[model samples]
Target chain A: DIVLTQSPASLSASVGETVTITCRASGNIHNYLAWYQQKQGKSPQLLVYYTTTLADGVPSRFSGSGSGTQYSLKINSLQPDDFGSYYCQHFWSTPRTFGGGTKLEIK
Target chain B: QVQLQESGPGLVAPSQSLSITCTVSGFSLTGYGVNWVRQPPGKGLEWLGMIWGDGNTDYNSALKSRLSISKDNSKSQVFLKMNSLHTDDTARYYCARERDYRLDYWGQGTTLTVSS
Candidate 1:
């Protein structure tokens, strides 16, 4: 099973500022990474999948990049709606491991 | 128009088991795989297991001994059963739809508390 580790368990940023969260894979996971955002008290929703593809209905500011064991989710000019917890996942294999999750706070 | 809804008991006793049903609509169960993922209060998500469209299954090695996932294509429903429940098992359980290795749709989730 591949393990995914996310950084900065929690952070604070204001609307209009940009934030980037990193996710590292225990082994080489290629480009099989995806990202999800969960608002407080709600279920998670996919934002980006397959490393860099934005899921339908996601805003332009929400994007993903990287490959192999290193990947990141970037929110450019964040909005109040972006305040929530973010998680990264790897589909390189079964077990579908997930990152610890990063909580983004809007100031 | 894809939607998934999870239903089950809100409380369970230690040493017992938990069973959740995820009913889906707007899509054929045979066209997608369904997975059971969970989150403990204020904790990160955990992938319990998955049942593919073809009826094959895969599970997190850490939970394989106690976790099982099954589906009824005719009713567009997925089932999750885990034995030996404990305090740590108290969490909000979710069922999600998998597409090309990524979770594309998720149920609203059901909260379960293991006590007494």
Candidate 2:
């Protein structure tokens, strides 16, 4: 099982500010990283997949990048709606693993 | 246009088995694979396992012995059973479908609590 480690467990940013969270895989996940956002009590929503491809219906401000064992989700210009927890998941194998998660709070 | 709903008891006793069902609508069960995911109180999400349309199941190596995933195409529903429940098993369980390597759709999630 690949272990996904995420940095900056929590962060604070103002609206319109760009925030970036990083995730690293124990082994090369073949660029199969995906990012999701969970707001309060609502179900999670996919923001990006396959490293850098934004999911359909996702805001353009949300983007992802990186390869090999490292990946990152970047919110180009954060919005009020972006306040929540963001998690990165590795789907290269079964029992896909997820990052510890990063909480984005309003500054 | 796809939606999933999870149904089951909200509380379970320790040392017992936990069961939950995910019923999907607006989609064919045989056309996609459903996976179980959980998130402990105030914790990050964890992938449990998945059941393919053909009845094939794969579980998290760490949780294989305690997890079971199955689906009924005719009913467009998927089932999850986990044994040896403990306080750690308390969490919100979600069922979702994988689309092109990403979990495209997810159930609203059912919170399971273990007491007594």
Candidate 3:
């Protein structure tokens, strides 16, 4: 089992600003990580997968990068629609786990 | 263009069982897997289990004993049955498509409440 620890439980950023959310795994998971965004009253939407690959239909401003136990999801020129909760997940083993989540808000 | 829709009772009594159905379209169940996830109010996401394309199933160890995932490929439907429910089981349950270990398409989710 792998545990993903996410940082900065919440952040306030202005539109057009850049933001980065971090996730650290309990052990080396190579690139078996993914990022998801969830808006209020909606299902989570995949933003990035395989550590650095963007999911289909995702905006170009969203990017993922990392290896081993550390990974990150960066939003370049964030937009108002990006304001929501972000979660990181690992699929290195069974009982897949997710981070506590990071709530992003427009300031 | 894949889509998933979940349906089931909105409320269940404690110590009872919960049964939910997931109907999918724009894809074949035999070629893809469907996973069950849940989120408690004001809490993070939790993986309940998954029914693989070949009919195999895997579950979260924490809920393995009480969770069962099955599918009917002929009907393009997936079913989730969990027994001995408790108050903590109250949450919004969702079904998603699994590919390369990541969930790509997701259902709107069904909210369940356990009471009296």
Candidate 4:
């Protein structure tokens, strides 16, 4: 069971502010991590995959970094559309898992 | 134009078996892997398992005991069966396409309530 720990369960950020959500894995995942954003009442949308590859149509402001077990999803300039819950997932092994999630509130 | 739709009974008796079907379209089931994930009313997402493109299945060890993932490529459908359903099993279940380590597409999801 590779566990992923996400810090700062919730955050409030002003529009245009830069924010980074961190995810630490219980074991080295070898960069098999991805980030997703779930808008209000909507299914989650993938933002970044394979560490830094942005999903189709994802904004440039969204980026991912880190390797092994340490990872972070950074938003260069947050927007209202980004006001939602963000989650990190790992595919290093079976029983793939996700982080607790970080709820971003844009003000 | 890929699409996945999850459907199942909305209510299940406690300690009973829960089954869900993910009917897919616009893509070949054998061409991509599909995974099932769930979330409680106010909580985060949890990955249950996935049926790989090669027809193999994988599941979370914590849930492997009572979980089974299977697919019918001829019907373009994936099935999930979890026994010993508990109240904590109540959640909205989703099926999504897995590609290159990312869940690129998702289904609308179907909510299940565990009650007696």
Candidate 5:
């Protein structure tokens, strides 16, 4: 099982500012990384998948990048609705794993 | 657009079992995989298991001993049964559709509490 470690457990940012969250895999996961956003009391919404592909209906400001064992999710011009928890997941192997998560707050 | 909905008991007793059903619409169950995921109160998500498009099943090793995933393609429904439940098993359970490595659609999730 690949372990995903996410950094900066939490962040507070102003609207319109760019906030980036990073995920590092314990082993080579190629580009099989996905980013999800969850609002309070709701199931996660897929933002990016396959390292850099945006999920359907996701806004243009949400993007993903990286390969090998490193991946990042960047929110450009963050909107108020973006405040919530973000998680990174790797599907390169079974027992798929998710990062501890990053909590984003409106500053 | 595809949509998923999960239904089951909201409470269970420790040492018992949990059974949840995920019903999907706007898509064929034989053409998509359905996966079960859970989240404890204020905690990160956990992948439990999945019933693939072909009706094959896979599970998280940590919970394999207690987890079973099955599907009814004719009804577009997926089932999750986890036995020997414990307090730690209390969480909001969800079902989602998998496309490649991505979970493209998710159910609203059903909260389950294991007590006593």
Candidate 6:
């Protein structure tokens, strides 16, 4: 099982500012990372899959990058709706794992 | 436009088993795998197990002793069973669709509480 660590734990951002979160894999996961967003009391919503590929219907401003053991989810010009928790997952092997999560707050 | 929904009891007695069902809509089940994930209140997610498109299964080695995941590809439904429930087993369980290495769609999770 791979361990995915996310940074800052939480953040405060205003609308239109970019909010960035980073995810690092314990080992080379070969770009098999995906990003998810979870609002209060809701199931996680898929944001980006396979490193840089945005999931269907995701806004253009939401993007993903990196490869191998490091990855990130960038929300450009963050919107009020983006205030929530974000998690990164590595699906390279069974017993898949997720980052502890990064909570974004509107400032 | 794929969607998943999970249904089950909200509370279970300790020492009993917990069961949940996930129903998929708008997609053929044979083309995708379904997985069960859980999150204890305010905690990170845990991958309990998975049932592949071909009906084969895999579980977290640490949890295989108590977890069972199965699916009916023809009916587009998946089942999750965990035995000997305890307080630590209380969590919101989600059913998700796996497309390749990533989870592409998720169900409206069901919160299960194990109590005396």
TM-score for each predicted model, relative to the true structure: 0.98, 0.97, 0.97, 0.97, 0.97, 0.95
Q: Write the per-residue lDDT of candidate 1 for residues A1-107, one digit (tens) a residue.
A: 88989998999999999889999999999899989999999999999999999999999998899988999888999889999999998887687889999999977
**Regions more than 4 Å wrong, model 4:** none
lDDT-based ranking: 4, 3, 1, 5, 2, 6
**Model 5 root mean square deviation, Cα atoms:** 1.0
Per-prediction TM-score of chain B? 0.97, 0.96, 0.97, 0.98, 0.96, 0.95
Q: Point out where model 6 deviates above 4 Å.
A: none
- TM-score order, best first, reads 1, 2, 4, 3, 5, 6
TM-score of chain A of 6: 0.97
Q: Candidate 2: which stretches are off by over 4 Å?
A: none
- Candidate 6 interface RMSD to the true structure: 1.1
Candidate 6 lDDT over residue span A1-105, tens digit each: 788899979998999998779999888998988899999999998989889988779999998999988898889999888999999988886778889999899
True lDDT of residue A92, candidate 3: 83
- What is the alpha-carbon lDDT of model 6 when measured against the actual structure? 0.89
lDDT of 3: 0.92
Worst 10 residues of 1 chain A by lDDT: A89-98
What's the CA RMSD for each of the models?
0.8, 0.9, 1.0, 1.0, 1.0, 1.4
> On residues A27-57, what C-alpha lDDT tens digit does candidate 3 reach at each position?
8988999999999999999989999898888
State residue B84's C-alpha deviation in candidate 5, in Å.
Answer: 0.9
> What are the chain A TM-scores of the candidates, in order?
0.97, 0.96, 0.97, 0.97, 0.97, 0.97
Docking class of 1: high
**CA-lDDT, candidates in order:** 0.92, 0.90, 0.92, 0.92, 0.91, 0.89
lDDT by residue (tens digit), candidate 6, B43-100: 8788888888877899988889999987777778899998999899989999999887
DockQ values, each candidate: 0.86, 0.88, 0.86, 0.87, 0.83, 0.76
lDDT string, candidate 4, A66-103, tens digits: 99899998998888888999999998877799999999
Which ranking of candidates, highest DockQ first?
2, 4, 1, 3, 5, 6
Q: Write model 3 residue lDDT over B1-116, tens digit each, in one string.
A: 89999998898899998899999999999888899999999988998888889998989988899999998888999999989999999999999999877899999999999988
Native-referenced DockQ of model 3: 0.86
